[PDB]
């Protein structure tokens, strides 16, 4: 791929280091943002709390993040996603992967 048009950076964005010298006017964290909160074993709200500000500094005008919050209802799917309420977390295929979530209102504000 033409270097000018496509660039590739290794290492996670969850770690503060990675953000040195990476400026893009728009970021998209779809399919990852949920796994990072789980990988970094951190709270979902607290996670994006440190990511959003990095994208601002990274020089970003737009953002798209596939966050997993029950905005419509706290109701879950029997086989697709279980919503453990004791601890804000999901269970895509109950176990196959577990990723913390936020609430529509708290995460919104």
């Amino acid at each position: 791929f033409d270097p000018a048009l496509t660039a590739y950076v290794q290492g996670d964005y969850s770690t503060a280091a990675f953000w040195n010298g990476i400026r893009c006017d728009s970021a998209t964290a779809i399919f990852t943002i949920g796994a990072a909160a789980a990988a970094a074993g951190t709270d979902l709200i607290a996670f994006v709390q440190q990511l959003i500000p990095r994208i601002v500094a990274a020089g970003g005008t737009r953002m798209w993040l596939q966050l997993n919050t029950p905005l419509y209802e706290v109701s879950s799917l029997p086989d697709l996603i279980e919503i453990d309420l004791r601890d804000h977390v999901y269970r895509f295929n109950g176990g196959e992967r577990v990723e913390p979530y936020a609430d529509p209102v708290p995460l919104q504000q």
Binding site: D2, P3, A4, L5, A7, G21
Partner: protein
């Protein structure tokens, strides 16, 4: 073959004597070997390019074919009958002397012609940076033109011939792609006459730039072999010449330099004062050698130089001790009987010569700068000469005061004007100085870790130390330049050293419990800062007490590494950090594209 062509003057049989430079009415035909045609073709090629501007302006005279200055003679072509006999060339292409004259004055006359136009084309071309180094970036032609229609000052030549310069231009800037006549659209590819050269200069994103990284290497290789960086810590007599010491006149501030910190400067450390006298220009003055030790430039161990002691801006307290005023400051030699540092009183000082006094007492040389009267910048100055001090075991140069009448006021003054910035300039390179002696050869390795912190900064202009510093300094710029001694890349330099530390720390572990298996991650890192500390401040490697750097191995080691390291760089050495370097170039082209965007709007 090469050289002038010869032919059998004795006919037929061509032996090593029946030859003779085939000269004649045109001069002597000298052979034009394959490569030498590359030049004259490359030179003429760069002129033919300007064809459209030669016709436009009725100068020139048609395209210059190199085949108009040569011929097709045949004979034996060498440098001398003997060796020319082994180069029988048939119908070779030779250029006669009188021709070697025109191809010369033509390329010269035409070169002026174009050099001029070529200058106008430029103030207009570069006047819109037609060169980016990452990705592309256009700028709608209409605007561009209608824009330069402005900027370009009324005396260019790109306004008198637009598409007479444009046609010359298209062949030099693969940025301007002319619109094809029968499809009225660009071409994607740009075909400038410098097709290849221009392709091989683009900053290729894989590795910086071949033309760059290539030279930065051959450049370093030049130095490495040239100055003689190799052999930098050689342990054996070396003629000062081997150090090409030039443009080397260092300046100080004595009367401060401790005697042990630099052999070429002894001091009169005596109890009381040593007032002496001397009839200078009739008037009798008294040299003082006041209260303090009064450090004086020793004369032996002083390579016949040009000592020029400047005394300016320095205090001149004629305000208090009136004794000081009236005394003409002057650099004076002092021959003592008993060796200095053993010279107690006046009767000890053989004689005193005023090698250079300052006309007018100390009250005209002054200048008030807020109470504390300073010294109007003036330079006293001897011209010491090795032998003018022959035999004379003890003699010292002293830039003192010459008081016309010593008094009680000047009983704690001590008129040494040495606090001034003295500037010795070795006037006879062949002879160097070391540890106080004058020599003709140094022993490099000896001067390493043998000076002290300041037994270096106090070195005497063109003395071993200053020479074994001017040398490391070259080798320091070869590594600093070519080798990457400034990144975590454990380069060839910091690598040559690591192997020494190992082999060293490894045998120091031999015999006894060997409880410590060599480290390596710690050794690599220790030698990295060692090679790094060197590139940093080349000097250090002379000071006693510097970690790693001052062990006999290193340096002798380093250089010979850095040596082979340059002789293999490849071409794509620029691959180092060629990532951020690339990303920075795209950064610029994005900002330059931003410029073209305005040129594109403002001037629609």
């Amino acid at each position: 073959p090469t050289g002038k062509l010869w032919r059998p003057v004795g006919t037929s049989v061509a032996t090593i004597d029946s030859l003779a430079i085939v000269s004649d009415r045109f001069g002597q035909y000298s052979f034009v070997n394959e490569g030498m045609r590359e030049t004259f073709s490359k030179a003429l090629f760069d002129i033919n390019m300007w064809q459209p501007l030669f016709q436009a302006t009725k100068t020139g005279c048609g395209p210059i074919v190199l085949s108009s200055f040569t011929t097709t003679t045949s004979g034996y072509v060498g440098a001398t009958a003997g060796d020319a006999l082994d180069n029988p060339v048939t119908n070779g292409v030779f250029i006669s002397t009188v021709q070697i004259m025109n191809l010369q004055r033509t390329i010269a006359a035409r070169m002026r012609d174009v050099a001029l136009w070529q200058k106008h084309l430029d103030t207009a071309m570069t006047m819109l940076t037609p060169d980016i180094s990452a990705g592309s970036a256009s700028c709608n032609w209409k605007s561009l033109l209608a824009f330069a229609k402005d900027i370009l000052p009324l005396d260019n030549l790109c306004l008198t011939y637009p598409n007479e310069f444009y046609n010359v231009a298209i062949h030099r800037y693969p940025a301007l792609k002319p619109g094809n006549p029968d499809t009225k659209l660009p071409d994607a590819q740009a075909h400038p006459l410098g097709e290849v050269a221009g392709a091989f200069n683009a900053a290729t994103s894989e590795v910086g730039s071949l033309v760059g990284s290539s030279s930065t290497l051959s450049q370093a290789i030049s130095t490495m072999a040239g100055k003689d960086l190799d052999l930098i810590e050689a342990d054996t007599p070396l003629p000062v010449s081997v150090f090409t010491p030039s443009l080397a006149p260092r300046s100080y501030r004595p009367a401060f330099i401790k005697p042990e910190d630099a052999k070429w400067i002894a001091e009169f450390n005596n109890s009381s004062l040593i007032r002496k006298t001397l009839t200078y220009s009739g008037a009798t003055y008294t040299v003082q050698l006041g209260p303090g030790p009064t450090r004086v430039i020793d004369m032996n161990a002083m390579i016949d130089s040009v000592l020029t002691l400047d005394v300016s801006g320095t205090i001149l307290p004629y305000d208090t001790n009136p004794d000081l005023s009236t005394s003409v400051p002057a650099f004076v030699l002092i021959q003592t009987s008993v060796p200095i540092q053993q010279v107690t009183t006046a009767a000890n000082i053989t004689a005193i010569t005023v090698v250079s006094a300052a006309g007018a007492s100390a009250i005209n040389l002054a200048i008030n700068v807020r109470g504390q009267p300073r010294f109007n910048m003036l330079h006293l100055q001897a011209t010491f000469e090795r032998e003018t001090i022959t035999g004379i075991p003890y003699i010292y140069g002293l830039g003192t005061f010459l008081i016309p009448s010593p008094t009680s006021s000047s009983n704690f003054s001590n008129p040494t004007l040495m606090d001034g910035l003295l500037t010795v300039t070795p006037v006879l390179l062949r002879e160097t100085t070391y540890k106080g002696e004058v020599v003709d050869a140094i022993v490099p390795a000896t001067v390493m870790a043998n000076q002290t912190s300041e037994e270096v900064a106090s070195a005497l202009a063109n003395d071993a130390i200053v020479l074994v510093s001017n040398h490391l300094n070259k080798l320091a710029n070869v590594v600093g330049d070519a080798i990457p001694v400034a990144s975590r890349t454990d380069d060839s330099a910091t690598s040559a050293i690591v192997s020494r530390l190992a082999v060293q720390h490894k045998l120091s572990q031999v015999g006894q419990a060997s409880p410590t298996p060599p480290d390596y991650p710690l050794l690599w890192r220790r030698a990295k800062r060692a090679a790094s500390m060197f590139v940093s401040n080349p000097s250090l490697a002379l000071q006693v007490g510097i970690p790693v750097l001052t062990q006999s191995g290193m340096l002798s080691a380093l250089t010979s590494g850095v040596g082979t390291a340059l002789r293999t760089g490849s071409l794509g050495k620029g691959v180092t950090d060629a990532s951020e370097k690339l990303r920075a170039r795209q950064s610029l082209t994005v900002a330059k594209q931003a410029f073209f965007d305005q040129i594109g709007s403002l001037w629609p």
